[PDB]
């Protein structure tokens, strides 16, 4: 017999009237193309530009009666990736590409096989940098949901319809790990049918829940953010007579805590709303600032102190020192409870 | 009958004398091309290079009598995006491109349909990085106006005219949100007819008002910029005898405020004029510097103090301490009123 | 006779039925392609994106009976790199490309020679940026293993099989040096046969062990991380009466050590687990923090001190000063032993 | 009649012997090509790499007798930008390109019109990143001169000559503003004829004077650079008995001034010569360092002070304090005059 | 007669049997191609990636008897750069490209002329980013030697040999200046013949000595690195009774010197060996650390001081103060001599 390359020349050549500019089943029902992606590499999720780089295998399956051969004895004929400009292909595109490219390492990474009944498998490797609106109302304890939509651009709903297959619409790699987030096993599948001034177009998308790993932020901006508050608590255990001791403590600590506040949003987007890490530094900033005002109240009584009425001012300046050793270690603990409970339920 | 691919070969082939290098209605009136864009993604507005990345759908509509078919029973014939090099297309370009590229993810993102009367719709996806002169006279409270002009390069006014359509000249996406700014619903539409040494060319543009969100700057460079001034106010409530207490306070605070001034223009363009954030740090720098000179005036009187005339110098050195507790908390409030009123009207 | 260019036109032209879209030995055994790479340049191994740039010479050898000439008197015929689109080539690709490109400096860097029996050598220069999951459980003393897999995309196992040659499967350059790591002479060779929903494909890979050089981290983040602890030890040799001396020492040192902790993960990925450099700064942070609490215990006894019972409190406040000069210099040495032994065996 | 597309096929087709590989007026005088650029966008002038990005419209005009039509009734025939590979074009190139690209947004931005006498206008949009040797002998008050040369590569002087036109050789945009520098209205026009081992080639260039805007540097690195010196002057108004007051002032200020010196060359090229900003920080570093040595001379006399001879040492230690309040405020003013006069004339 | 474009069609057309896939002098001696480069732009030598960007004019000259015309009366025929795919060209490539590109600004920057005897000149503009192993054993006083090799990829030694010409093998631009380094006039020329598993290939290279300019490092990291040591010397001229004076001096200076050590390797590669700038900061770190231990020895004697034996401890605590004023100013000078002598000979 003849090889599949010469066998398909009768179906993709000048004979049989086959044209790559004509969609299958013309003047009839639209083409129902089913798609399924395979995430190979994931990560590099930046927040300054609010985008993430993904590498998926976009599989496409449809039905073309013009390529339904019945003379070849086999059931699957592989095609050279250099002959993709001869058959019709869906005009699939993403609405959040923001720059993309293919891979042509020694061969155009394309897969093309034709079944006997007319099933055509089209799998390619695409490297996308997808964008998603980052919701940072609770930055250290948020559940991001970055989606990706597959719309049409040249054909409307009556000519091309995208759908998901029931046999693993979205597969995940075996050893796919992320440096900062984690990929949940549950991925939603809903439609995203858009409507413009020209018409209506099909759209398919899949939700991806990306939960953060609190192990990183808990060590860098939570343990040092708590030890600095302890530095302001040790001033109560120091005598009220040493002026340079408690003054230098209430100033060097209250100024190095601002660096922690400025160092908590160094690589974060400039959002207007307040996040969960801005209420942890601001409240702890009040503790390192109230300790400065605490010494300002103790030193103000000692500098004012008549022999009988002045002996009570010394005890009054020391009575507040007996409560500050218990108030702040018990008030900061109350805020430490309302913080790790409200942001663990919402 | 015959499919539209073979039907349009009579209108785009060697027959009928149709050439892609000839504009419609030659030796007559110019081609009136109407355009309308659809902003899909917006943001990433940097200030060091004074540019912003945009992703729009550039729709183009004109009239070509050479493509006015009258035999096909339908009213809209879709075209393959691979056949855009056969018909005439307007030479539309932007005067502020500064690098651009198309999107060819599995298909050239182009839309092409031809009506019966000769209406040709041309919609493509372009990713532009547009530039605009940043007016930073009031940096935290400015209303930026970044525009984009669509000029001609090969045809003059007598051969190609660009205009805006009245049915939604500029559409906005449904869920288009910006991280730093906000997009106003009012967009101006005016002409930008340029004149060069070669001739005159058409030009269409649309204004985009981008108001900032003060919620970000108010927390990072306004709350810490005010608490440092309070650190210089607590020196008045400290006795005038402790030298290392008030000296270290008037130096550590006046030097950490300069870091806030240098940290306020870390990612800003090097402009010559003064902005609204440079007058907030410089005036607050005077308060943290006047407190240093305030102790220099109190300590200078105590070191100079004859038994009757010296008792008044001690009261004089304490009389200024009774006014500094009221002057600065009431003078900084006056500047706090003139600042948030002048920059809220202009 | 005729030159090899005209001699091979009979084997690569329209005659002999040779087609570049047909794999050798069709309807029979699969093509056994042996590959061997030659690493020219290596390094630039970043950790923020977890990727490294490599430049190898990908050699490919297979058997094509359709190109087995028997009339030319020579044994090796060199081919012009501009004629690679006429013969069949394996669709080799990498599963961790993440962007790649060829080199076309004055000539496409391709090697093509055909033997008499049908051996075809295919060598090209590819610049890859390969990714690997960075295991940073012990950051300064880890042995990274970055691999690279060569999979198929268009042909399954029954049509294309990749294998390694026994004569130097992976060669290393003569003067290939790395700035940070070192390349070990032992490189493992194992298979990576994947299984997808479409079928099974061949895969070959080679392990690369990249041991770090501790000479860099030992000087920058280990010598200064130890001298700061010595600054907290000198407070014991200072009299317990000078308040501003020991207070300023226990605060300026405990706050500059946090900068060393924040400066140890400035260019590191945001991992959740704790690494070996996070337990060296945190434990040393306890020493510079216990010295602050040590003075808080000595000053608390002196401020409390009845004529006979008060003379023992002065000796008690000095007895702890006689143990702190020996405890911390001997407790930090114990942690210094358990650290450099546990992380030198695992 | 026939359209210009079919009319010019007789002049650009196989007939008439017109070839795009032959320069006009062969075996005779060279082609005198006149050029004129139009700067659209300017700025982004970095100093680390010593380059600036420019966007100009390169117009080219020459004479081609082979295209001198005499049958068409019009005087200017516009050409499709897709037919630039049919006529001869000058091989113009820049000697300081360092990477460049064109703009192909929906159309190749090319202009091509042919006059009756043979005048051919060629205007294209080129985005260049031009380099210039940065002369930073006086960094805040220099007048940079970045030029751009247009050389030939394939034709020598006897075959191609570039010249400037007298009617606006270099035009400037109407609203072209720069963020840091300013563009002067005077632009020099001189030749740059080079000589290599192959021969001599034509060259045209234009000088661009880029004066800096001192409004930026005067606020960031000149006002804080002067207030720190004032902090060292207030130590003279403090009593000579307070040791921790004047010691902490002469150390915290002398160390934060080094940050201003290191912060003045953070984004500057590593040049060997000294600039005008390195002599302003180094001299001011002497003032904040002489104040430290001033207290070292006052405290050395007080610690040495026999009942009559010791009373003069106290007055001697205070006599220098009466001159330091007048010397430094009058010596720093002398350097402030010689600095803003020498660098305002050269 | 006929123009050179039509004259060379007889030598580059279907007639005469000329093929671009055949090297000259086949079945005979190899082609001796002589090359000579012309460095136009040089600099941008980074150290994090260990690469430098260069822009050279790669001239190539060989002998092709098939192009030896004898009928044209001239001696040099210029060729259009669009016809380089018709003649044979050497497959020259660099072994350290790491990404490269050509320049196509309005014309492919290629030079092609053919002599009567068969001499063919081939000059193109290539922008390379070449790599070299940075030897940083003495960072401020090293002599870097970055080379560039020109190897073959498709032809072995018996088919293509590269050589250097004796008439200026490597030329330098007239006004080529470097921001950091300097280019020496002496450039070595040696062979780099490599040997692989396939065979042996020709190779030509040229050495480039790049000496650093010490004027930059001497001001930024050598003058401030010496003044901080002077701050530790002034503590000896202060009385031994002021505790907060000498304690704060021996801590604030010893901690700001570590920033100079961390600030000396901010943009340097992470090498394991010690460089010449790491022994200048570490030794100076001992001086600012020995001054802290010097006060720890003086204060330890004063706190210990029986009426006759205690008067000698006061003199002993002051005797070391009389030697420290002379020891350190004379010991640091000894290290200052051995440093600037050992690294000025090797
Ligand atoms: C692609 O998928 C669409 C569905 O999304 C298919 O369209 C549906 O096709 C049926 C005929 O097969 C149309 O008729 C209906 O038939 C059912 C019985 O199956 C009957 O109960 C209904 O009353 C109706 O007559 C139906 O209108 C149509 N639906 C839509 C929304 O178009 C289409 O056939 C598929 N195309 C191919 C090539 O498989
Ligand atoms: C494209 O749009 C232009 C307008 O921007 C159209 O041009 C105008 O066309 C009219 C004829 O239709 C020209 O004549 C005028 O007619 C009015 C009555 O409608 C009459 O009152 C005037 O006195 C005049 O005779 C008019 O001069 C012309 N204007 C310009 C500025 O060119 C043009 O026809 C449109 N082209 C197409 C193909 O639709
Ligand atoms: C490519 O390599 C494969 C092996 O990976 C070759 O396949 C093996 O080929 C033999 C025949 O040569 C097949 O038959 C076996 O022969 C042995 C004797 O050599 C006999 O003991 C066995 O019982 C069996 O009959 C064998 O099944 C086959 N193995 C596989 C896994 O396919 C193949 O021939 C190679 N192709 C070329 C073109 O060299
Ligand atoms: C392109 O420009 C060059 C000048 O840069 C033109 O060349 C000059 O052409 C004249 C003839 O037109 C040559 O002859 C001279 O004529 C003058 C009178 O005009 C006479 O006084 C002189 O003694 C001499 O005979 C002249 O040598 C030549 N100069 C050079 C440097 O080539 C050239 O003609 C222009 N080409 C075109 C096509 O316009
Ligand atoms: C390209 O350069 C090579 C040299 O690198 C040329 O090869 C040498 O060519 C000579 C003949 O011209 C060969 O023969 C020798 O001749 C000398 C007298 O000149 C004689 O004393 C020797 O005993 C020997 O017979 C020589 O073997 C050969 N050397 C090599 C290494 O190949 C070659 O001819 C040049 N090609 C062209 C086209 O110019």
- Show the 3-state SS of C149-200: EEEECCCCCCCEEEEECCCCCEEECCCCCCCCEEECCCCCEEECCEECCCCE
Contact E243 C248 (CB under 8 A): no
Could you tell me if B257 and B175 lie in one domain?
A: no
Looking at the DSSP bridge assignments, the partners of residue A160 are: A31
Tell me the three-class secondary structure of chain A, residue by residue.
CCCHHHHCHHHHCCHHHCCCCCCCCCCCCCEEEEEEEEEEEEEEEECCCCEEEEEEEEEEEEECHHHCCCCCCCCCEECCHHHCCCCCCCCEEECCCCCEECCCCCCCCEEEEECCCCEEEEEEEEEEEEECCCCCCCHHHCEEECCEEEEECCCCCCCEEEEECCCCCEEECCCCCCCCEEECCCCCEEECCEECCCCEECEEEECCEEEECHHHHHHHCCCHHHHHHHHHHHHHHCCCCCHHHHHHHHHHHHHHHHHHHHCCCCCCCCCCCCCCCHHHHHHHHHHHHHHHHHHHHHHHHHCCCCCCCHHHHHHHHHHHHHHHHHHHHHHHHHHHHHHHHHCCCC
* Residue C32 Cβ < 6 Å to ligand 3: yes
In angstroms, the first-to-last Cα distance of chain A is 68
Do C122 and C61 meet the contact criterion of CB atoms below 8 Å apart? yes
Q: Would you say E188 is a known binding-site residue?
A: yes
Within 13 Å and on the Cβ side, how many CA atoms surround D55? Answer: 18
Assess contact for B244 and D244: CB atoms under 8 A.
yes
- The set of residues, in sequence order, having a beta carbon less than 8 Å from that of D193 and lying 6+ positions away, is D157, D200, D201, D202, D203
Rounded CA-CA distance D278/D265 in Å is 9
Q: Can you say how many angstroms the Cα of residue E29 is from the centroid of all Cα atoms in its chain?
A: 39
Contact (Cβ atoms closer than 8 angstroms) between residue E81 and residue E103: no
Neighbours of D303 (CB within 10 A): 14
Q: Measured between alpha carbons, how far is residue D171 from residues B200, C68, D40 in Å?
A: 16, 66, 9
* Residues B62 and B29: beta-carbon distance below 8 Å: no
A178 contacts A146 by C-beta, under 8 angstroms:
no
Cβ count within 10 A of residue E184: 12
User: What CA–CA distance (Å, rounded) separates E115 from E121?
Assistant: 8
B301 and B182 together in one domain: no
Residues C42, C182: one domain? Answer: yes
The count of other CB atoms within 10 Å of the CB of residue B190 is 11
Sequence-separated (6 or more) residues with CB below 8 Å from residue E322: none
Please indicate if any CB of chain D lies within 8 Å of the CB of E80.
yes
Rounded Cα distance between A126 and B141, Å, is 42
DSSP class per residue in E204-221: EEE--EEEE-HHHHHHHS
Phi-psi region of E341 (alpha: psi -120 to 50; beta: other; left: phi over 0): alpha
H helix or E strand, kind and range, residue E182: strand E181-183
In terms of Cβ atoms closer than 10 Å to its own Cβ (0-12, 13-18, 19+), residue C28 is exposed
Q: Exposure of B97 by Cβ count < 10 A (0-12 exposed, 13-18 middle, 19+ buried)?
A: buried
- Cα separation values, D241 from A245, C164, D307, D319, Å: 19, 83, 20, 15
Q: How far apart are CA B317 and CA B323, in angstroms?
A: 11
Question: Domain count of chain D?
Answer: 2
**Which positions ≥6 away from A110 have C-beta within 8 Å?**
A81, A84, A122, A123, A124, C153, C154
Q: Is B179's Cβ below 8 Å from some Cβ in D?
A: no
C161 vs E274: CA distance, rounded Å: 49
Q: Which residues contact B168 (CB under 8 A, 6 or more apart)?
A: A197, B36
Residue C255: alpha-carbon gap to chain centroid: 33
The 8-class DSSP code of residue B78 comes to E
- For β-strands B77-78 and B110-114, DSSP reports them as antiparallel
Looking at the structure, do residues E160 and E248 belong to the same domain, yes or no?
no
CB E116 within 8 A of CB E70: yes
CB atoms within 10 A of CB B87: 21
Quote the distance between the C-alpha of residue A121 and its chain's center: 31
Residue C182 bridge partners (DSSP): C211
Rounded distance, CA A159 to CA A204, Å? 16
Interior angle at CA D317, CA D314 and CA D322, nearest 5: 120
Q: Which of D93, D252, D299 sits opposite E103 (nearest CB)?
A: D93
Distance separating alpha carbons of residues B24 and E119, to the nearest angstrom: 52
Question: Residue C197 and residue A171: Cβ atoms within 8 Å?
Answer: yes
What angle, 0 to 180 degrees and rounded to 10, lies between the N-to-C axes of helices D243-262 and D278-302?
A: 160
Last residue in a domain, options E186, E213, E240 = E213
Distance in angstroms (rounded) separating the CA atoms of residues D41 and A157: 43
Dist. CA B15–CA A211, nearest whole Å = 62
Backbone angles phi, psi at E54, to 5 degrees: -130, 150
Contacts of E299 (CB under 8 A, 6+ apart): C237, C238, C239, E240, E243
Range of the domain at A197: 1-213
The whole-angstrom separation of Cα B187 and Cα B185 is 6
Scored b (16 or more CB within 10 A) or e, C201-237 reads bbbbbbebbbebbeebbebbbeebbeebbbbbbbbbb
Q: Using the 3D structure, point to which of D194, D213, D232 is the last residue of a domain.
A: D213
Q: Are residues A281 and A208 in the same domain?
A: no
Give CA–CA dist A25/A63, Å, rounded. Answer: 9
Give the long-range contacts of residues E17-21, CB within 8 A, separation 24 or more.
E18/E66, E18/E67, E19/C3, E19/C5, E19/C6, E20/C80, E20/C82, E20/E85, E20/E86, E20/E87, E20/E88, E21/C5, E21/C79, E21/C80, E21/C82, E21/C83, E21/E88
Residues of D in contact with B100 (CB under 8 A): 103, 105
* CB neighbours of residue A177 within 10 Å: 12
B226-254: string of b/e by CB count within 10 Å (b at 16+)?
eebbbbbbbbbbbebebbbbbbbbbbbbb
CA neighbor of B162 nearest in space, from B42, B37, B55: B37
Angle of helix C243-262 relative to helix C224-233, nearest 10 degrees, comes to 160
Do residues B330 and B318 make contact, with C-beta atoms less than 8 angstroms apart? Answer: no
User: How crowded is the C-beta side of A47, counted as CA atoms within 13 Å?
Assistant: 15
**C72 has binding-site annotation:** no
Q: A29 in ligand 1 pocket by Cβ < 6 Å?
A: yes
Domain boundary (B165, B182, B213) is at: B213
Pocket lining: E25 vs ligand 5, CB cutoff 6 Å = yes
Q: How far apart, in Å, are the Cα atoms of C46 and each of C49, C91, C140?
A: 6, 29, 15
- Distance from the Cα of A143 to chain C's closest Cα (Å) equals 16
Nearest ligand 2 atom, CA B163: 5
The CA-based angle A277-A275-B260, given to 5 degrees, is: 70
| Dihedral, CA of residue B211, residue B214, residue B217 and residue B221, to nearest 10 | 130
* Cβ contact B109:B81 at 8 Å: yes
For residue C106, count CB atoms less than 10 angstroms from its CB and return exposed for 0-12, middle for 13-18, buried for 19 or more: buried
| Cα-Cα-Cα-Cα dihedral sign, residues D5, D7, D8, D14 | positive
- Mark out the alpha helices in E240-309 (DSSP H runs): 243-262, 278-302
B27 and B114 fall within a common domain: yes
Check if the beta carbon of residue D238 is closer than 8 Å to that of residue D299: no
**Ligand 4, atom 7, residue with closest C-alpha:** D29
Rounded Cα distance, B317 and B300, in Å: 9
Residues D219 and D181 in one domain: no
d(CA E131, CA E147): 8
Q: Which residue of B has its CA nearest to D179?
A: B271
Are B144 and B271 in a shared domain? no
Q: Are residues C178 and C240 in the same domain?
A: no
Asked if A154's CB is within 8 angstroms of B110's CB, the reply is yes
Chain E residues 158-177 within an 8 A CB cutoff of chain C: 159
Q: Are B2 and B14 in contact (CB under 8 A)?
A: no
Check: CB of residue D210 under 8 Å from CB of residue D191: no
CB A114 within 8 A of CB A87: no
Angstrom distances, CA of residue D19 to CA of D24, D252, E129:
10, 78, 38
Distances (CA, A) of C281 to A63, C344, E253: 63, 19, 22
Q: Give yes or no: residues D231 and D114 share one domain.
A: no
| Helix, strand, coil percentages, rounded to 5, for chain E | 35, 25, 40
**What span, in angstroms and rounded, lies between the C-alpha atoms of D253 and E274?**
33
DSSP letter string, B122-163: EEEEEEEEEE-----TTGGG-EEE--EEEEESS--TTTEEEE
Give the separation between CA E309 and CA E305, rounded to whole angstroms. Answer: 9
Burial of C97: CB neighbours in 10 Å, binned 0-12, 13-18, 19+? buried
Beta strands at B160-164 and B31-46: parallel, antiparallel or unpaired: parallel
Beta strands in chain D (DSSP E): 31-46, 51-63, 77-78, 92-94, 100-101, 110-114, 119-131, 143-145, 148-152, 160-164, 170-172, 181-183, 189-191, 194-195, 200-201, 203-206, 209-212
CA angle E34, E38, E41 (to 5 degrees): 150
DSSP notation for D81-115: GGGTTSS----EEETT-SSEE---SSS--EEEEE-
Q: Rounded to the nearest 10 degrees, how much is the dihedral formed by the CA atoms of B297, B302, B303, B307?
A: 140
State residue A204 phi and psi, 5-degree precision.
-130, 145
Nearest to A109 by CA among A75, A84, A91, A77: A84
- Residue count of chain E: 346
Q: How many C-beta atoms surround the C-beta of residue D168 within 10 A?
A: 12
Same domain, C206 and C228: no
Return d(Cα E242, Cα B302) in angstroms, integer. 22
Choosing from E29, E61, E65 the residue with most ligand 5 atoms within 8 A of its CB, the one to mutate for a pocket test is E29
Enter the DSSP assignment of D276: T
Q: Could C21 and A82 be called an inter-chain contact, meaning their C-beta atoms sit closer than 8 Å? A: yes
Query: Rounded to whole angstroms, how far apart are CA atoms E278 and E285?
Result: 10
Cα dihedral E314, E320, E323, E324 sign: negative
d(CA D216, CA D220): 7
Cβ neighbourhood burial of E296 (10 Å; 0-12, 13-18, 19+) = middle
Give the Å distance between the CA of A118 and the centre of ligand 1.
19
How many other β-carbons are positioned within 10 Å of the β-carbon of residue B183? 17
Beta pairing, strands C110-114 & C119-131: antiparallel
CA A278/CA A31 separation, integer angstroms: 52
Same domain, A260 and A206: no
| Residue B324: its H or E element | helix B310-342
* Residues in contact with C66: Cβ distance below 8 Å, sequence separation at least 6, in sequence order: C11, C16, C18, C24, C118
The answer on whether D7 is annotated among ligand-binding residues is no
List, in order, residues 6 or more apart from C20 with CB less than 8 Å away.
A80, A82, C85, C86, C87, C88
Which technique? cryo-EM
């Amino acid at each position: 017999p003849m090889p599949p390359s010469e066998f398909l020349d009768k179906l993709m050549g000048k004979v049989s009237g086959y044209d790559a500019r004509i969609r299958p089943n013309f003047k009839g029902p639209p083409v129902n193309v089913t798609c399924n992606i395979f995430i190979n590499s994931f990560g590099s999720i930046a927040e300054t530009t609010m985008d993430y780089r993904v590498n998926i295998f976009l599989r496409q399956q449809w039905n073309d009666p013009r390529l339904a051969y019945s003379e070849y004895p086999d059931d699957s004929l592989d095609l050279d990736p250099s002959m993709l400009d001869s058959i019709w292909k869906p005009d699939l595109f993403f609405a959040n590409e923001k720059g993309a490219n293919f891979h042509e390492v020694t061969t155009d990474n394309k897969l093309l096989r034709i079944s006997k009944n007319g099933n055509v498998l089209y799998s390619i490797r695409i490297t996308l940098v997808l964008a998603c609106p980052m919701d940072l109302k609770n930055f250290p304890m948020d559940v991001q949901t970055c989606i990706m939509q597959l719309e049409s651009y040249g054909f409307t709903m009556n000519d091309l319809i995208f759908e998901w297959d029931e046999k693993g619409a979205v597969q995940v790699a075996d050893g796919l790990t992320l440096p900062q987030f984690i990929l949940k096993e549950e991925k939603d599948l809903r439609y995203c049918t858009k409507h413009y001034n020209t018409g209506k177009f099909t759209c398919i998308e899949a939700r991806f829940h990306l939960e953060r790993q609190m192990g990183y932020y808990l060590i860098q901006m939570y343990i040092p953010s708590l030890l600095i508050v302890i530095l302001s608590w040790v001033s109560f255990w120091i005598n009220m007579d040493a002026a340079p001791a408690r003054v230098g403590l209430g100033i060097t600590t209250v100024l190095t805590m601002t660096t922690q506040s400025s160092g908590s949003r160094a690589s974060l987007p400039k959002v207007s709303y307040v996040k969960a890490i801005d209420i942890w530094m601001a409240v702890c900033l009040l503790f390192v600032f109230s300790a400065l005002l605490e010494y300002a109240a103790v030193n103000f009584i000692a500098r004012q102190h008549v022999e009988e009425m002045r002996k009570l001012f010394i005890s009054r300046a020391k009575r507040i020192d007996t409560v500050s050793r218990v108030a702040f270690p018990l008030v900061f603990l109350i805020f430490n409870i309302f913080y790790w409970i409200t942001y663990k339920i919402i």
